[PDB]
Amino acid sequence: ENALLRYLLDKDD
Amino acid sequence: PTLVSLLEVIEPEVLYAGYDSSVPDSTWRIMTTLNMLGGRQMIAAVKWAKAIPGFRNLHLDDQMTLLQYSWMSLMAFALGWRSYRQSSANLLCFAPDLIINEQRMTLPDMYDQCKHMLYVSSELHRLQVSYEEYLCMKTLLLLSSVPKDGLKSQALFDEIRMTYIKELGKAIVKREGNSSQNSQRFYQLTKLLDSMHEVVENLLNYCFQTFLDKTMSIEFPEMLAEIITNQIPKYSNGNIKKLLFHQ
Ligand SMILES: C[C@H](NC(=O)C(C)(F)F)[C@H](Oc1ccc(C#N)cc1Br)c1cnc(C2CC2)nc1
């Protein structure tokens, strides 16, 4: 559903 | 380290619009470029939010919920700040290479959206908002709306939000005013925070219509298209509780 946002929150910065 | 100093170090880097000034202006062209810039600002806003003390302790669904409700208040508030800092005039400083001057606001249909954003910078200027007050207020805009049935980590959110409300209080006291002037300032700044709900409702009405009308050919990057697609049904179902400091 909100693929890009979930990815940015879950990835390591 | 003080909490406001931790909010200060995570302030995003300057983003340029990549606007070719050697090609003439048009409302459609400016709106398209600003949507692209907006998507890049929202990607940077995710990285910003994850570094806010307390934010990553919320349930992942709550982190997503808060960024999806507050997107436009974050962008308008940060824009209002850049505009207030870069000019003591009626300019919208979206990016250093894309400033909405007096001539650009005469472009057809430009002013409609611009007046809502000009109100934010006008208010920060009228209230002479400080850097520290601004940082506390911007974090509080991230925490300014929740679902009508609340968050998964509602109790922890309430604790985090109260902590940043106290941080705004501490920033206000630093202006070295008396107890009565500090109470007036807290009232004024929280009144501006409340008014961002109205500013954003006006920006979203226009933005949602522009996104839905495919015949306008106004492009939105993936980040903004995904937020808008998520938000339109939430507003349609009344699924939003706008937090207020005053009634
Ligand atoms: C999402 C929104 N799209 C719209 O409202 C629209 C026009 F497409 F419907 C977009 O909002 C922003 C974009 C970038 C930043 C930054 N930095 C901040 C914001 Br707030 C926008 C705002 N105003 C304009 C033009 C000037 C009238 N064009 C695009």
Cα separations (Å) of B10 from B46, B52, B102, B155?
Answer: 11, 8, 33, 25
Check if A12 contacts B (Cβ < 8 Å).
no
Instruction: Please report, for chain B, how many H helices and E strands are present, in that order.
Output: 8, 4
Tokens of B82: 């850049």
CA B95 – CA B79 distance, rounded (Å): 9
CA B170 – CA B125 distance, rounded (Å): 20
Tokens of B174: 């630093």
Q: What are phi and psi of B92, to 5 degrees?
A: -105, 110
Give me the long-range contacts of B232-241 (CB less than 8 A, separation at least 24): B232/B208, B234/B68, B234/B69, B234/B147, B235/B204, B235/B208, B238/B148, B239/B147, B239/B148, B240/B69, B240/B145, B240/B147, B240/B148, B241/B145, B241/B146, B241/B147, B241/B148, B241/B150
Say if the Cβ atoms of A2 and B68 lie within 8 Å. yes
Nearest Cα to Cα of residue B242 among B64, B59, B54, B66: B66
The pairing of strands B98-100 and B241-242 is unpaired
* Closest chain A CA to residue B44: A8
- What element of type H or E holds B94? strand B92-95
CA B229 – CA A1 distance, rounded (Å): 9
Check if A5 contacts B (Cβ < 8 Å).
yes
Say if the Cβ atoms of A2 and B64 lie within 8 Å. yes
Q: Report the residue among B31, B92, B202 best suited for mutation to probe ligand 1: largest number of ligand atoms under 8 A from its CB.
A: B31
Say if the Cβ atoms of B64 and A6 lie within 8 Å. yes
CA A5 – CA B16 distance, rounded (Å): 22
Nearest Cα to Cα of residue B241 among B116, B136, B104, B148: B148
- Ligand 1: lining residues by beta carbon, under 6 Å: B 30-31, 34-35, 37-38, 41, 72, 75-76, 79, 94, 100, 110, 113-114, 203, 206-207, 210, 218, 224
The pairing of strands B98-100 and B92-95 is antiparallel
CA B65 – CA B44 distance, rounded (Å): 17
Neighbours of B89 (CB within 10 A): 10
Method of structure determination: X-ray
Structural domains of chain B in order of their starting residue, each with its CATH number:
1-247 (1.10.565.10)
Instruction: Give the minimum alpha-carbon distance from A3 to chain B in angstroms, rounded to a whole number.
Output: 8
DSSP per residue, B123-141: HHHHTT--HHHHHHHHHHH
